[PDB]
Design a protein around this ligand. Structure first.
Ligand code: HEM
Ligand code: HEM
Ligand code: HEM
Ligand code: HEM
Lengths: 146, 141, 141, 146
């Protein structure tokens, strides 16, 4: 995660606007909806039968909240992503056993949700800046896989 | 495969894309080049700078190939038959690069159609672009 | 797609696999579990230790599904129709895991058929296992 | 690249047998043969029209030789793979622009070739040990991609 100073302005200024309550749920939900196999890990979340049941499930909106917490956090620790996620890495890695590829799928949805909410403000440059971030996190989380 | 619910969702959101078709097509392109540099290697004779009329003309070209797909969905293979040879035989495009464009294509749509881009339709397009990708990389398998 | 040269190569090397079919099937399995641990999550009720009769019985099961594929290649979708629902609907197997098995499957064949595993056939099987994978993950797209 | 001491014995003992001249060419060639798009990077290698033309091309056998050099090398520097490949990373990364995914495809073929030559000796445990190695290299080479 290098990030030039004007890529910094992009990412930063945008983040401070994100509804940090709803957005986190919008992404985890579309994940289960668009990439079904991921549901395998949240069976204990209740009925995940329709995109409606999923977009409405409280466990979902209550989990994405946390998930976005890990991003905000990461976003203010780009210097060291590995450290920040060592605990989470270990967890998703030698405990849940999530294929690291799903971290990239989650980052990309998160990116779609951000494009969804800011429509035109989310320009290509702001996206390119954010794609680097999603890649950084996705790799820190999969570090325990070595 | 694509379910009827899917091809109805695809046909609607694309309907809504309307005449901005060729425009959104040049926007996905520009997005991919900036986010995934490694893709620029296929467009040397292109001036990939922000205003490139070349990038523009290609975007129109990309939109149209996608429009040809929606209006013949139940039979893409035969329809994109030709673009298959071109991308797989002549250009040898890495298959990974199709997943990167399909993405910038969903990010372009989502940033233009806030009302339609619902999770359900979001999933339908993704299958559509996935199927379009498989056809173009068919002449590999 | 698979070319006639491909389906002839596949049909030959599998012919050569003969009765060791169910054996090579349990070998791929064992190889995948050891190389890619993350896959063991689908076989809890299985004792994935070296001698597991369970792993054995499944290997026979895997070989047979592959044999059903070679002998009906020009029409796998309809043929693996059923295994599609099972792996995609009921088990929700991550699609990535098919690429990992197809690999241990080629490493198992290569270690048993030195004479046949030529680059040409190597490429043909890879397309075959790729196509088999697409069918089983079809009920996703 | 952690590698337990008996995984070490596996990898090591095997390597010292590999025909370090032919094997390197066997892998780069099957790569171009099985994953066609990769040919895009070696057009200057001459006729790569048939698996025969490819398996017989001198440039190929002359390049795989080097490629295996980078593996032998890596194999005796597991402790630090990133450093060993910093130069090569940079090269394949911001110069040739090879999609990191192709490093994983090359590692897997290399693994098939090794199974091909040692047949039964190349057991699952020896493969699992070698798969970790191919993964290590594939990630060191893609480091400049951050
Ligand atoms: C960018 C990637 C991701 C981030 C930042 C992330 C973050 C988190 C966090 C912070 C937790 C809760 C930790 C706690 O409660 O202390 C968690 C738990 C979990 N994650 Fe993720 N996660 C990611 C990707 C995924 C993916 C792709 C899956 C796979 C489908 C997944 C499956 C799980 C599950 C099931 C839990 C629930 C753990 C429990 O039982 O409490 N996560 N994740
Ligand atoms: C969604 C999938 C894609 C579709 C539908 C698509 C469609 C097209 C079409 C219609 C053409 C022009 C055909 C003609 O009029 O002669 C074309 C050309 C081309 N495409 Fe794509 N394409 C896609 C993805 C890609 C990707 C992933 C790459 C690589 C980044 C790629 C690289 C090229 C190149 C290099 C050309 C030739 C441009 C030129 O020489 O002017 N395409 N594509
Ligand atoms: C080459 C592709 C594969 C083929 C041809 C295949 C074929 C089969 C067959 C025939 C069955 C048993 C059906 C029956 O008799 O009821 C089955 C079950 C199963 N497969 Fe696969 N499979 C493949 C890949 C995978 C992968 C990638 C995974 C995950 C690592 C997976 C997970 C399972 C599981 C969990 C079962 C059920 C086992 C049980 O409950 O006893 N399969 N597969
Ligand atoms: C495990 C991964 C790989 C290793 C260890 C590796 C190693 C090497 C080495 C040592 C060189 C020559 C450096 C020199 O002459 O000083 C090289 C060059 C090159 N590599 Fe690879 N490589 C890898 C993967 C690939 C892949 C997948 C491609 C993509 C198709 C590729 C494309 C190239 C090309 C075209 C060159 C020729 C450079 C020239 O013009 O001299 N390599 N590689």
């Amino acid at each position: 995660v290098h990030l030039t100073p004007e890529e910094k302005s992009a990412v930063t200024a945008l983040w401070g606007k994100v509804n940090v309550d709803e957005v986190g749920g919008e992404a985890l939900g579309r994940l289960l909806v668009v990439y079904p196999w991921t549901q395998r890990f949240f069976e204990s979340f209740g009925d995940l039968s329709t995109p409606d049941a999923v977009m409405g499930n409280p466990k979902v909106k209550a989990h994405g909240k946390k998930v976005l917490g890990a991003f905000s956090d990461g976003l203010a620790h780009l210097d060291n992503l590995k450290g920040t996620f060592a605990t989470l890495s270990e967890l998703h890695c030698d405990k849940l056993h999530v294929d690291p590829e799903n971290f990239r799928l989650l980052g990309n949805v998160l990116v779609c949700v951000l494009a969804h909410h800011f429509g035109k403000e989310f320009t290509p440059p702001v996206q390119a800046a954010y794609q680097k971030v999603v890649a950084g996190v996705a790799n820190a989380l999969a570090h325990k896989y070595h | 495969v694509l379910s009827p619910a899917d091809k109805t969702n695809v046909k609607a959101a694309w309907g809504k894309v309307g005449a901005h078709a060729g425009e959104y097509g040049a926007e996905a392109l520009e997005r991919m080049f900036l986010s995934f540099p490694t893709t620029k290697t296929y467009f040397p004779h292109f001036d990939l700078s922000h205003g490139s009329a070349q990038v523009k003309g290609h975007g129109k070209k990309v939109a149209d190939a996608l429009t040809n797909a929606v209006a013949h969905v139940d039979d893409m293979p035969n329809a994109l038959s030709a673009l298959s040879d071109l991308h797989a035989h002549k250009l040898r495009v890495d298959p990974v690069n199709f997943k990167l464009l399909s993405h910038c294509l969903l990010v372009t749509l989502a940033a233009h159609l806030p009302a339609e881009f619902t999770p359900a339709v979001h999933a339908s397009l993704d299958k559509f672009l996935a199927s379009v990708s498989t056809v173009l990389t068919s002449k590999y398998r």
